[PDB]
Ligand binder design. Sequence first.
Ligand SMILES: Cc1cc2nc3c(=O)[nH]c(=O)nc-3n(C[C@H](O)[C@H](O)[C@H](O)COP(=O)(O)OP(=O)(O)OC[C@H]3O[C@@H](n4cnc5c(N)ncnc54)[C@H](O)[C@@H]3O)c2cc1C
Length: 433
Amino acid sequence: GFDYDVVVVGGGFAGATAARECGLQGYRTLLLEARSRLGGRTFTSRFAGQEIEFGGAWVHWLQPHVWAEMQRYGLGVVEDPLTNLDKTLIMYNDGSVESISPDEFGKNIRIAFEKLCHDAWEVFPRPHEPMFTERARELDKSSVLDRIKTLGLSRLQQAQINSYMALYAGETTDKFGLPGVLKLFACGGWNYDAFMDTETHYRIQGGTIGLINAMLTDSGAEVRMSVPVTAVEQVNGGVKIKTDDDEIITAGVVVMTVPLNTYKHIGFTPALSKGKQRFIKEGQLSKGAKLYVHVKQNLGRVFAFADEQQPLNWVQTHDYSDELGTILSITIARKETIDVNDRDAVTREVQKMFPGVEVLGTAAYDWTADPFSLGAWAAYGVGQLSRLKDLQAAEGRILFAGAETSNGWHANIDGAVESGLRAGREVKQLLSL
Ligand SMILES: Cc1cc2nc3c(=O)[nH]c(=O)nc-3n(C[C@H](O)[C@H](O)[C@H](O)COP(=O)(O)OP(=O)(O)OC[C@H]3O[C@@H](n4cnc5c(N)ncnc54)[C@H](O)[C@@H]3O)c2cc1C
C-alpha cells in the first residue's frame, strides 16, 4: 500500500548506485534529491571558457567498485597528463613562501608520506575491514598530528605532509583521525606510487554526471529533484517521507545516502539508535571548499602546498597559455581561513603566493556553506573510525549509505559506490529475505 517499493534519498553516487541495484531487481524505486541537480559532492561546471570540477572527479582502477561500474557501462578514463612541473611552492604557517626544485619537492613529500604510513601493512592487512587488527583500534586514539610529531621530519617535510593531511582532514591535523589516513594508503596497494596515481590523474569519460545518469537510466527509477526530505517516519509496512512542501510519500524501505553532516535537517521517528545519534551529532570533520582563479599571467605548470594556518592549501595549474594566462585549481582545507566567494579576499591570498599577479576572475563552490553538504569529502575525527558500524547499521526499515559509511575508499567516489551496493543488498533482504 505504498507509492514505491524503494525510496532512495540523495542523488549522489551512493544513491544512484543504490537506485540501480533496487531498480534492476524489479522494485518500484524513487530517488529524492534535495538540490536542483544530481551529483552531490561531484559537480562539473564551467569557468573561463573551460570545464572545471568543483567536487569529486578523479578515479582509478585500484578503486574496485567505481572501476567495475565503468566497465559495466563501458566508460574509459580521461587522463590529466601531470607533466613536468615548472614550479613547486610551500607556504608555511607564518605565511612565508619558498620555491623548491620539483624533484626535491617530490622527494621530500615521498619521505614524509612513507614515514607517516610506514605501518600500513601491519595495521591494515585488510583495508576493507578497517577494524580487523587491534592495532587499528588502538591507533584510533591518536590524531595525525600525534604521529607527525614523532617522525623527526625536517621543517619542509613537516609542512608538506601537514598541509597534505590538513587537506585530507578539511581541518587542522590535531583533530584528524590517523587510521582513516593509513587505511586509504593501504587501499592503494600499501604503496606510495600506486596510491599517488589515484589522486588527480584519471577522470571518467563522460564525467561523473554521466556515470550517475547511466546508473539511474539503467535502474528505471523515478527521479525527483528540488525535494529536500525533512522527516522520515517508520509507519506500518514501510516508512513515511516528508518533503518541504508538506508532501507525503510512502515506501516499504528508505535508503538514506545524504552526507552525515546533513542529518541535522531530517527528523527521524522513531529515534535512531544511540550509536547512530552520536555520529550525527559528531558529524565528519571536513570544512573544505573549492576555488578556481584565472590570472592574466602565464605561470606555467605550478603546484603549491600551504600549511593549515593558511588558506590556499592545495594549488595546481589547471591550464596555462600566453593567450589564456593561468587557471589555478585551489582546494581549501578550512573555509574559516577564507571566504572563497569574496574575490578581493581571494585576490590578496593569491598574491601572497604569486606576488604581483592580476586576477581576472574567480569561481568557487563553498561545500561547507551548502546546506546539503555542510562539509566536503568524508574525514573522520579521532575515535570515529572504530565506531563505523554504528553509522552503517540499518534502523528498522531505514538503510544508510554514503561515502562516510563505506569501509574502503571512504574519501572517494568509490566508497560512495561501495555503500550503494551494500544498501541495494540490504534492500533486497528487507523486501524479500
Ligand atoms: C571538493 C571535493 C573534491 C573531491 N575530489 C575527489 C576526487 O578527486 N576523487 C574521489 O574519488 N572523490 C573526491 N571527492 C569525494 C566524492 O565526491 C564523495 O566522496 C562522493 O561524491 C560522495 O558521494 P555520496 O553519494 O556518498 O554523497 P553526496 O555526493 O554528497 O550525495 C548525497 C546526496 O544527498 C543530497 N541530499 C542531502 N540532503 C538531502 C535531503 N534532506 N533530502 C534529499 N537529498 C539530500 C545531497 O544534495 C546529495 O546529492 C571530493 C569531494 C569534495 C567536497
